[PDB]
Design a protein around this ligand. Structure first.
Ligand SMILES: Cc1cc2nc3c(=O)[nH]c(=O)nc-3n(C[C@H](O)[C@H](O)[C@H](O)COP(=O)(O)OP(=O)(O)OC[C@H]3O[C@@H](n4cnc5c(N)ncnc54)[C@H](O)[C@@H]3O)c2cc1C
Ligand SMILES: Cc1cc2nc3c(=O)[nH]c(=O)nc-3n(C[C@H](O)[C@H](O)[C@H](O)COP(=O)(O)OP(=O)(O)OC[C@H]3O[C@@H](n4cnc5c(N)ncnc54)[C@H](O)[C@@H]3O)c2cc1C
Ligand SMILES: CC(C)c1ccc(C(=O)Nc2ccccn2)cc1
Ligand SMILES: CC(C)c1ccc(C(=O)Nc2ccccn2)cc1
Ligand SMILES: CC(C)c1ccc(C(=O)Nc2ccccn2)cc1
Ligand SMILES: CC(C)c1ccc(C(=O)Nc2ccccn2)cc1
Lengths: 587, 586
């Protein structure tokens, strides 16, 4: 046990010192490594449960049982006397830099998970490279370092969502006594895009500075794994070459799908294009019903667009369907149109006026699930019908990395692939929630295990979400239907309530539109299986309850905790109406 | 064990049925009870672990061991056959209404705690009265049913806070691309107070409807406990009379303090007056440094006021002082002036212009702690120098209810006073956090124990708070300095970080928002306190209070994954310690 951990730690760490906090010979060695600017991992044995056992096992590698001991890339280098000898004779730099490979770690993909992994590895002395390349969209859109969330995902969509939220703040202000006239105020799309893009540019630059300042080599190049340790790179002049690395992390993400119909790729766009679009989309058709589809349709309408959503079957497939219908009903009442049970069969009527900064004009033909016909004109068509990786671009099938039926990488619970030195993290890891904080945790925890002897795994269970539709929807845990299916209706109790934000009272907003529920398991001390809230600031409300749910919260835990007044969130601490009772949840 | 519980439950329940869910004879009795409209508590012996023991113990009271058994005010009434007999013979209504007292429960005080207690008790068949009276302020201000929070507390102050927050939303709008010009927009105070007061009135009315619909007698009169069971009342015509009750709940709250200086009561106001003031206060001096003082100064400044706060010693005494100073620094950078280490020694220069709807004008003289002099003119002077009960207006000394040095009621952990049938809840319960949700929980749990045989006690530990200053401050648990005093600096580790809301990026400050976890090293890095300064701090904080109740450690925060993008997710990845000396900036 200790033996197998020690062997694993020594063989994969780049530079690691086994030390004790009390020993002055260790302090003397650390100061030498610091002066020569040699980064390394440190294991303080006088601070572990069985540091006394580890000390004995080190002898199997070094033939000595004492401390300090310094290792480089699996090889014992020396004790205090021996390392200072190398430093005195100017032999230390060559010892710590000699390696079978160009790099201790190559990360393919410069996004949420990839950049996190790369920065953390370099912290412990691993010589690291991060490759990033953004294949342009069909109309040519491209962007800088940071991945999907930073450039064409969470960051710009939540900023445009805020811009939509400000429209209702402006209406609310009259009722709170401010003198503005909401009716005489308009919105300027391109002014908003400029501010959003200027923030994104500051993040592109921040990441390049972080990589430099951590001694990480950044190559803006497309990488392709051709053998377990060989990566073929292609730079911006199409120059091809090969670099080698001990450990490999695949972190290349996904891109939007298009439906296989005429006109789609030629005349429509996706969220990849929307966030830097130089003109306001205008009358817009959104095809799809994922959280991407609904979030974009939501702020476009709040910024004054004529928005329609074409829905093939249901909204938010995979989420609690009662909550999904409440989300959609709110959007329909505040000016989003829906074309339900409908799929597209696109014709161009006007080309994009790239001079005067104006959209084109399109004709969309489709049909409903019973056979009736759809036909209508739109200035912009946005597709949001899912995302997929294309690992045939990234990874040669000869290498031996097993993929699933969807094209995602099959990993063990420590992100290891079927090839012992190759790992995968983020959206391409099969079966895991596809979220930015998840990929960041996976990458940081992997790097620590590879290069610092850490043991902690990433926990992928009960990860909380928030959908940033005009009225936001937070969740943690099981949907109601999933709990019933897993345990049976008789074993599931559901507490719920409508509520009204105190901020909505003076503004004359709706009484019984916000909603929340706890789905609980009767036979397990009324364990909270899932939490669900529809209302403002839903992600801030939900986050903290995810710690309690990780810890096994029951209904009695919610009951004995006191509320903060006045808040939306406090309604969770006094819930009492059950669905079984039949009593109304309104307030 | 069981037998002492049963005796206590039977003695004080007004009407209670011992029952089994399966039994059709019990269902038959249930069906008769309402129809006659008899509210009652029910205990299902087949749902309790020791139901077999309780069934046996009942025989000590009724000389029978079966179900159903129905009791009224401590006396066994009968089984199925006997209850139906009383029903057919028109005798049941008189049985259930027979009482030594006028009411099973008298609640003195119609506020957060008292309204909660009374409504809950009436659910289980207790005949209940709630008394509320609002002694006018020195200038005459009064208001309706619901207590301090509803009328002159949490509700109007958070609505005015929201009006203040909207000023900055109006500025932020231009950067997100909206065409308005913030510099040409003004605020109308009276329009805002009208909307606030209309909501408050709808709460006043809602409470009167709630008591009606629960069969609670609402008396708009002042109450005084003159003996353990005797409450003297004085109605709005000064008519005096006496009502009796079995159980008594004291729930009379506090009112604002004035300092003992010339001009204070005559020419200044308190928060009691602020939330319905007919004119904008204008240039305003706030004396005090409580959360009331800072919250009012803060929104008045956002609504265009020229505001100064006069601080005797420190801000937010009793809260974490690092967080307190960050709160104050932000206010000082965004308008509010502070007269630090200063106390007042008030002259009237203009009387309030009630006709033209304008404030008067005052001269304030005071001094700093080094002896230098303060002298300055203001239109409104708001005192926020604490709050206090006045139980020598509620409670005759001869009754025997013990008070502490501050004048609050000394209570057991089940809210019992030194007089066995008299209880106290809310702000006047000595040593308890003085917060509305606490009073509500205390009243509801007490009613269940008195009238439904419940056993659950209110848990007053680690109750979360939020101060709604212009940048909000949420907390749950120990301040950092309190943790260190109790355990020693070497056993305390603090993780912290600045952060920037994503909404602040396009609107253009980088390192003002802040959060920390104060942890105990020798107890698996247990989270002893959480603290956050930032927008929506109350929404951020609430959910972590459940995890802290459950004993959360730093490892529990670390293994939970963030929601992106949120301010709150910063709690899930904290790693910079204060001992490291590394900067918390971002
Ligand atoms: C519109 C939208 C909104 C979203 N909103 C949220 C939200 O609010 N919250 C949330 O948690 N998640 C959100 N997500 C999901 C989140 O963006 C992803 O889960 C996350 O970005 C995935 O990180 P990753 O490291 O796996 O890959 P990515 O972030 O996609 O980065 C992978 C990078 O590798 C590059 N790459 C690909 N192939 C190669 C190659 N051969 N060589 C070199 N580089 C290559 C890609 O171009 C990209 O830069 C959103 C996604 C979208 C599309
Ligand atoms: C400005 C301000 C802001 C606040 N903000 C918050 C906040 O955001 N969150 C929070 O949790 N708490 C807040 N509080 C505290 C909250 O108001 C109290 O904790 C809570 O209202 C106390 O409830 P209570 O039942 O003890 O008394 P109260 O709510 O004060 O009600 C007592 C009632 O009894 C009446 N009464 C008194 N004497 C008699 C008598 N002899 N006969 C009959 N009736 C009588 C009183 O007139 C009053 O109506 C705030 C307080 C103030 C002053
Ligand atoms: C095989 C095919 C997918 C391919 C074609 C071209 C390139 C290319 O132009 N790369 C690059 C790198 C950085 C910035 C700009 N361009 C890479 C791969
Ligand atoms: C059908 C209805 C919901 C609708 C909604 C919004 C508008 C609008 O004010 N703007 C608009 C329209 C077309 C292109 C761009 N913007 C018109 C109609
Ligand atoms: C307007 C209505 C609410 C009301 C008004 C006054 C009184 C009253 O007579 N109070 C009292 C208090 C102290 C000494 C004498 N009387 C009771 C209710
Ligand atoms: C900081 C301080 C000098 C100040 C702040 C605000 C104002 C202001 O615009 N209004 C105002 C003035 C008097 C009474 C009420 N409001 C004037 C001076």
């Amino acid at each position: 046990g200790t033996s197998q951990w020690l062997r694993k730690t020594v063989d994969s760490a780049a530079v690691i010192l086994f030390s004790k906090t009390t020993c002055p010979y260790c302090k003397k060695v650390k100061d030498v490594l610091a002066e020569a600017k040699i980064k390394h991992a440190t294991i303080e044995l006088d601070q572990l449960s069985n540091g006394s056992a580890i000390q004995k096992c080190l002898a199997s590698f070094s033939k000595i049982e004492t401390v300090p001991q310094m290792f480089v890339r699996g090889k014992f280098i020396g004790d205090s006397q021996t390392v200072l000898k190398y430093y005195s004779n100017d032999e230390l730099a060559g010892i710590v830099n000699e390696s079978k490979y160009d790099y201790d770690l190559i990360v393919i993909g410069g996004g949420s998970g990839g950049l996190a992994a790369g920065k953390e590895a370099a912290k412990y002395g691993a010589k690291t490279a991060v490759l990033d390349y953004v294949e342009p969209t069909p109309i040519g859109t491209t962007w800088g370092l940071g991945g999907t969330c930073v450039n064409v995902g969470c960051i710009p969509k939540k900023l445009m969502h805020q811009a939509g939220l400000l429209s209702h703040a402006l209406e609310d202000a009259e009722h709170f006594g401010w003198s503005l006239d909401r009716s005489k105020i308009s919105h300027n799309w391109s002014t908003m895009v400029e501010g959003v893009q200027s923030h994104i540019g500051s993040l592109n630059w921040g990441y390049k500075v972080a990589l430099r300042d951590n001694q990480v080599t950044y190559l803006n190049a497309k990488g392709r794994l051709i053998s377990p340790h060989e990566v073929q790179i292609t730079d911006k002049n199409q120059k091809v070459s090969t670099i080698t690395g001990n450990k490999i992390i695949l972190a290349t993400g996904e891109r939007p799908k298009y439906p296989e119909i005429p006109g789609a790729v030629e005349y429509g766009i996706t969220s990849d294009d929307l966030f830097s679009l130089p003109y306001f989309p205008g009358k817009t058709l959104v095809i799809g019903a994922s959280y991407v589809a609904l979030e974009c349709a939501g702020f476009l309408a709040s910024l004054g667009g004529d928005v329609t959503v074409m829905v093939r079957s249901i909204l938010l497939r995979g989420f609690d369907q009662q909550m999904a219908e409440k989300v959609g009903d709110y959007m329909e009442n505040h000016g989003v149109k829906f074309a339900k049970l409908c799929v597209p069969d696109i014709k161009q009527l006007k080309v994009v006026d790239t001079e005067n900064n104006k959209p084109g004009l399109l004709l969309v033909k489709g049909h409903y699930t019973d056979g009736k016909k759809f036909e209508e004109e739109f200035e912009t068509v946005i597709f949001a019908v899912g995302r997929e990786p294309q690992l045939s671009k990234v990874l040669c099938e000869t290498v031996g990395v097993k993929l699933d039926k969807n094209g995602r990488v099959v990993c063990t619970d420590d992100e290891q692939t079927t090839v012992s030195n190759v790992y995968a993290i983020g959206d391409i890891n099969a079966g895991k929630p596809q979220l930015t904080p998840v990929a960041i945790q996976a990458g940081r925890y992997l790097a620590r295990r590879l290069f610092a002897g850490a043991t902690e795994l990433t926990d992928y269970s009960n990860v909380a979400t928030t959908v940033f539709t005009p009225l936001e929807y937070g969740a943690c845990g099981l949907s109601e239907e999933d709990a019933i299916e897993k345990y049976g209706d008789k074993d599931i109790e559901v507490y719920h309530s409508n509520f009204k934000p105190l901020e909505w009272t003076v503004a004359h907003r709706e009484d019984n539109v916000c909603y929340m529920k706890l789905v609980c398991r009767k036979s397990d001390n009324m364990r909270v299986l899932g939490l669900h809230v529809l209302g403002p600031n839903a992600g801030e409300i939900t986050q903290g309850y995810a710690v309690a749910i990780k810890m096994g919260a029951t209904k009695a835990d919610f009951d004995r905790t006191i509320g903060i007044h006045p808040t939306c969130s406090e309604t969770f601490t006094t819930l009492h109406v059950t669905k079984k009772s039949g009593v109304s949840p309104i307030v």
